[PDB]
Design an enzyme around this catalytic site. Structure first.
Site, mmCIF file in Angstrom:
data_model
loop_
_atom_site.group_PDB
_atom_site.id
_atom_site.type_symbol
_atom_site.label_atom_id
_atom_site.label_comp_id
_atom_site.label_asym_id
_atom_site.label_seq_id
_atom_site.Cartn_x
_atom_site.Cartn_y
_atom_site.Cartn_z
ATOM 1 N N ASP A 10 0.982 -1.671 -0.034
ATOM 2 C CA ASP A 10 -0.212 -0.240 -0.080
ATOM 3 C C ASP A 10 0.555 1.334 -0.334
ATOM 4 O O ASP A 10 1.586 1.304 1.014
ATOM 5 C CB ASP A 10 -1.026 -0.346 0.735
ATOM 6 C CG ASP A 10 -1.672 1.547 1.435
ATOM 7 O OD1 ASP A 10 -1.579 2.243 0.463
ATOM 8 O OD2 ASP A 10 -2.137 1.667 2.529
ATOM 9 N N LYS A 71 2.707 11.072 -3.883
ATOM 10 C CA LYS A 71 1.574 10.530 -4.599
ATOM 11 C C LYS A 71 0.469 11.995 -5.158
ATOM 12 O O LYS A 71 0.235 11.913 -6.015
ATOM 13 C CB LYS A 71 1.476 9.808 -2.882
ATOM 14 C CG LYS A 71 0.014 8.910 -4.173
ATOM 15 C CD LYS A 71 -0.060 8.152 -3.023
ATOM 16 C CE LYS A 71 -1.841 7.140 -3.584
ATOM 17 N NZ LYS A 71 -2.155 6.270 -2.478
ATOM 18 N N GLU A 175 -7.032 1.092 -4.288
ATOM 19 C CA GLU A 175 -7.322 -0.007 -2.861
ATOM 20 C C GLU A 175 -8.336 0.118 -2.515
ATOM 21 O O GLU A 175 -8.067 -0.574 -2.241
ATOM 22 C CB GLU A 175 -6.623 1.858 -2.692
ATOM 23 C CG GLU A 175 -4.665 2.496 -2.515
ATOM 24 C CD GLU A 175 -4.902 3.844 -2.223
ATOM 25 O OE1 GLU A 175 -5.289 4.822 -1.868
ATOM 26 O OE2 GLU A 175 -3.715 3.647 -2.933
ATOM 27 N N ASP A 199 -12.796 5.159 3.106
ATOM 28 C CA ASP A 199 -10.853 6.096 3.060
ATOM 29 C C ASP A 199 -10.786 6.817 3.533
ATOM 30 O O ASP A 199 -11.310 7.607 3.201
ATOM 31 C CB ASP A 199 -10.232 5.328 2.188
ATOM 32 C CG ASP A 199 -9.257 5.158 2.422
ATOM 33 O OD1 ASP A 199 -8.117 5.481 3.597
ATOM 34 O OD2 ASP A 199 -8.550 4.758 1.335
#
Ligand SMILES: Nc1ncnc2c1nc(Cl)n2[C@@H]1O[C@H](CO)[C@@H](O)[C@H]1O
Length: 385
Positions: A10, A71, A175, A199
């Site tokens: 992850d 990211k 994800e 999330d």
């Protein structure tokens, strides 16, 4: 041996996690400091390059050369309004190399510039070495996860980060798909299954709606807030304690950078305690001008301080349901992802919005994505033989 082994990674905005599926169970691998998640930070110093906890631990002393949020840049053009807007909030330099952003830093006394994929590859190399230290042999096959809204350019730059890091990328998976796999939601037999993944991480909030039809995954909707996460809750605690210090001592600490950072790390710790206790204590020796700051806060006060922020998580949930053209009663499963979903008020707000429904939360929410990636990596490497 190593050729029959595969890991699940992850690669998160703020934290990364690595898992391995062996002997019928997933093992989330602890790093050399005993932590099951590692900060997605890379520090460039006068003598060395630091990755993870060691990089995060010296961010205050070296902010211009400590890279994080790579990211947010990966797979994007320099001219992208997301990049231009984010650059104003980072202490490190972002430069333009042929419409491609590079992070520019000082390393061993020299000016060096790195592509976001080179920064992410350093994080991936660390996750790879954490797995190798646990396994006793080098593992090179990996499943790496990405947000469901990542386009082809962001997915390709993530795979490139994997190649630079020495990994054979078996697949780039979403994800929320890895999270649904973690809970075995693709193995319920026949019929379409609607899954909502909530999330809430350290710096981002994502809501995803998936349909699982005979093992086949389909993304129906993605919604959220790219600038909402656990760090906004720490900051609300910081402002409260800055005002409490002012009331008790008639002194404004807000300008003292060291005092604010020590208060911030203590607030983050107290916030975590508030997820399992109804109160948390702050114990800061000589916070400002030799004054100790020994205080406490209830879970009730913390919930008041972040009330508007917790409630704001329900607007993307409603937005995702309308985009997916589904009512609440049409969602079969609710999955929690991200460390911030451990907050009891957040769970209560989501459960009440879904009319008293049970939440899937038995897997550590900050580990569920690596868990599912590790399951998929085992299935994929077995099929490769
Ligand atoms: N016990 C907890 N109670 C509340 N927040 C938590 C908790 N654990 C983590 Cl991690 N976080 C936060 O989750 C993010 C990482 O996914 C960070 O913001 C961390 O503080």
């Amino acid at each position: 041996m190593a050729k029959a082994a595969a890991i699940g990674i992850d690669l998160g905005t703020t934290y990364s996690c690595v898992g391995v599926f062996q002997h019928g169970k997933v093992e989330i691998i602890a790093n050399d400091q005993g932590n099951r998640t590692t900060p997605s930070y890379v520090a460039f110093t006068d003598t060395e390059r630091l990755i993870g906890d060691a990089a995060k631990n010296q961010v205050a002393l070296n902010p211009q050369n400590t890279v994080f949020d790579a990211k947010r840049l990966i797979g994007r053009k320099f001219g992208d309004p997301v990049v231009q807007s984010d650059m104003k909030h980072w202490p490190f330099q972002v430069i333009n190399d042929g419409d491609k952003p590079k992070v520019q830093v000082s390393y061993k006394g020299e000016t060096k510039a790195f592509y976001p994929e080179e920064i992410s590859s350093m994080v991936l190399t660390k996750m790879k070495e954490i797995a190798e230290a646990y396994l006793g042999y080098p593992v090179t096959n990996a499943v790496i996860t990405v947000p469901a809204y990542f386009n082809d350019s962001q997915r390709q730059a993530t795979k490139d980060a994997g190649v630079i890091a020495g990994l054979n990328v078996l697949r780039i998976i979403n994800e929320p798909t890895a999270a649904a796999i973690a809970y075995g939601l693709d193995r319920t037999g026949k019929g379409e299954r609607n899954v909502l993944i909530f999330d809430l991480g350290g710096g981002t909030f994502d809501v995803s709606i998936l349909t699982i039809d005979d093992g086949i995954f389909e993304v129906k909707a993605t919604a959220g807030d790219t600038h909402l996460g656990g760090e906004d809750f720490d900051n609300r605690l910081v402002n409260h304690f800055v005002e409490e210090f002012k009331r008790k001592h008639k002194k404004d600490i807000s300008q003292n950078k060291r005092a604010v950072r020590r208060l911030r790390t203590a607030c983050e710790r107290a916030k975590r305690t508030l997820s399992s206790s109804t109160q948390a204590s702050l114990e800061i020796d000589s916070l400002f001008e030799g004054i100790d700051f020994y205080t406490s806060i209830t879970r009730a006060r913390f919930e008041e301080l972040c009330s508007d922020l917790f409630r704001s998580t329900l607007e993307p949930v409603e937005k995702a349901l309308r985009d997916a053209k589904l009512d609440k009663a049409q969602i079969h499963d609710l999955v929690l992802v991200g460390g911030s979903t451990r907050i009891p008020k957040v769970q209560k707000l989501l459960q009440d919005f879904f009319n008293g429904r049970d939440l899937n939360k038995s897997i550590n929410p900050d580990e569920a994505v690596a868990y599912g990636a590790a399951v998929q990596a085992a299935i994929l490497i077995k099929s490769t033989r």
